[PDB]
Amino acid sequence: KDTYEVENRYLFTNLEMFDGAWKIRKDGEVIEEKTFKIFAEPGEKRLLKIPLPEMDDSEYFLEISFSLSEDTPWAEKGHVVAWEQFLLKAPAFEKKSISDGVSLREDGKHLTVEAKDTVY
Amino acid sequence: KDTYEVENRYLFTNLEMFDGAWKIRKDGEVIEEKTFKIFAEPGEKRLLKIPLPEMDDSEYFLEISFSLSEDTPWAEKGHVVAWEQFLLKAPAFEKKSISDGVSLREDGKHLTVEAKDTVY
Amino acid sequence: EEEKDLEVTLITPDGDEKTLVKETVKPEDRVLSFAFDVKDPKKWSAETPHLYVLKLKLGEDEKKVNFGFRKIEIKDGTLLFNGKPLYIKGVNRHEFDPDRGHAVTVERMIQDIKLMKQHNI
């Protein structure tokens, strides 16, 4: 969950040329962003350690991305060349006992069901 | 759920000699009781209709018993000679997201976990 | 142009009467819809053909309809009538008379029905 293996598949490019970033998303919204650099020659595999926070019953998702450190003839600083995402933790589902009532009215052509301020 | 078939397996006795009762139990406590008599000769099967209440997310169980209408040389009025139970509705189980924290202290020979006012 | 009174009376198989509806109605092309409850009604079957009567009056216009309480349904591939398994003991009939062709009389219709019931159809 905290350990990730990066593999450089460029023929003639070191991964040091790119700005690394990782983000953690709680139920879709983010909560933690960090930048990093990683040295890896063409072909090489390198490990990446990501400290994780204590996590409540929400659903957590990591996203790891590389971008352009500075402008290029074909694109501007920050442009994203590669990303991958992973489920950290699934969510805990709640189930709630409902005590409140529901009415019902039958007529020739309709069944009517009332609950709070909604009629079906 | 409402309709039950009684079979009289005595050789020489009519079920009319016995006091019929049914009970409903919500999470184990009685909430409804009702007496009844049923005419059935030796061998016969008879139907028994039971009106059911509207039921919340709890677990309901129906019991149907027969007892002695009056004393006998071998037992008193109200002695039970037969009974059977049945599930009416399984319960709806709640799951609650917990937002409160938990503390952790490691030492040489013990891990200690505090939550509310209980230490494990 | 003038408004007319609408009355709807239910008559039981016994013969007892009850007013369901009594209201004035402005003259217009409309469809009025009503729903009424009836405790322990006498159910229509081929064995026991109990009929009720509706009596409908709007101004001087008067009509009468014969209905019977009965339910047909399919439960798990089985055909029910009033909540009992139904077995169709039937025959196919042509509206035919050897002297009159298709122009059959009520006296010949009644003969047919009494013959069918007397042979368990």
Side-chain angles (χ1 to χ4, degrees), chain B residues 35-62:
Chain B
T35 66
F36 72 93
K37 281 235 163 203
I38 188 163
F39 184 92
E41 296 290 19
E44 289 185 12
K45 308 192 174 179
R46 283 283 201 279
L47 288 182
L48 174 63
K49 190 65 175 62
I50 294 165
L52 299 181
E54 282 163 20
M55 295 180 292
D56 71 357
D57 277 342
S58 302
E59 187 171 74
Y60 297 76
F61 269 112
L62 175 73

Side-chain angles (χ1 to χ4, degrees), chain C residues 26-65:
Chain C
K26 68 185 67 168
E28 65 204 329
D29 273 52
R30 196 152 53 104
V31 177
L32 314 188
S33 298
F34 314 87
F36 321 102
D37 280 16
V38 176
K39 289 206 180 72
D40 299 315
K42 301 213 297 191
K43 290 179 275 189
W44 187 96
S45 76
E47 295 181 5
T48 67
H50 305 302
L51 293 169
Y52 290 74
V53 188
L54 278 189
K55 211 180 176 299
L56 300 100
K57 203 172 198 302
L58 180 70
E60 300 313 307
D61 188 18
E62 203 275 342
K63 294 185 172 65
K64 297 184 183 206
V65 183

